[PDB]
Amino acid sequence: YQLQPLSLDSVPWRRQPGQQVLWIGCSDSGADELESSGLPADEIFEYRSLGNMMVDDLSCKATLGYALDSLKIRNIVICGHYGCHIASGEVNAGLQKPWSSVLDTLRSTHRRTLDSLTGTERDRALVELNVLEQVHSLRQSAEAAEALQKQQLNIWGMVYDKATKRGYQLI
């Protein structure tokens, strides 16, 4: 994967005005992430959750179902963010399963990548890896797979950097 700086005026989830985009972000983003979306506020249908994850739960399934079935959304963005306290470090006791299992699996699957980095750079890699795995996982969902095979859905990953005040697409 590579990180491509977004140009606000040419984001792949806004090829035309006036549509809604399902924006999946993290509860501790704590800054101006939507100012890097390339979308006006009225085009954003926002689901903001622990770790910008979609897990096997009623909320994640109903939100996706409402977006595709009621709003006819054709674009989903999973936005992670540098400095995340949830997709960080090696443990957090107050984070329940399956969120904690997703991060355990990231850390074990990508151990050699993570072990090659230190401290803040490692946490930045874990943010990026979480976005990539959430995008891949969401495409394998039955509801997304059907819409993808009909060419009625795209799922995009990006990471927001509150220090550079920019978003970066995962390509």
Added chain:
Amino acid sequence: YQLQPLSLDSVPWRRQPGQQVLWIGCSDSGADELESSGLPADEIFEYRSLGNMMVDDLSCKATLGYALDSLKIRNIVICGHYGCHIASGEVNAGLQKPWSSVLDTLRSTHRRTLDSLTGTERDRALVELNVLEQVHSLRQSAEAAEALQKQQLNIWGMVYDKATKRGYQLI
């Protein structure tokens, strides 16, 4: 309840700066709700969901649990918003249970109030009633009840009006 306009001189969930507040808002708010919060971005721990509801699922439990245990959060705000498509009289076929059940129960429980109101007034009322019921229900969650009994948690209700760029507290 009554509605009281918010003042930055007396923000019930920001009696001091530098703490995190769990802000529960709706996925279709579609505007500048957080600019009416009385909070800087870095004090907002945001959970944005269908209808600004907490239903009894893993996502509720885990988000509330992480907020109270890991972040030591002492204030929760449930923010509704006028013009909501979910907390409205429009029953959309693609909204799943239990969200659709919560709204069904609201309509039948409050039908005396609601049967007398015309459309746009009935919808504003349903937004307010949904906030009030979500605040009362979240106080009965086991982790919130434990913190309330220690005087270590307050749950507040607000409604945001994007037309006037103002919040109203439910008192």
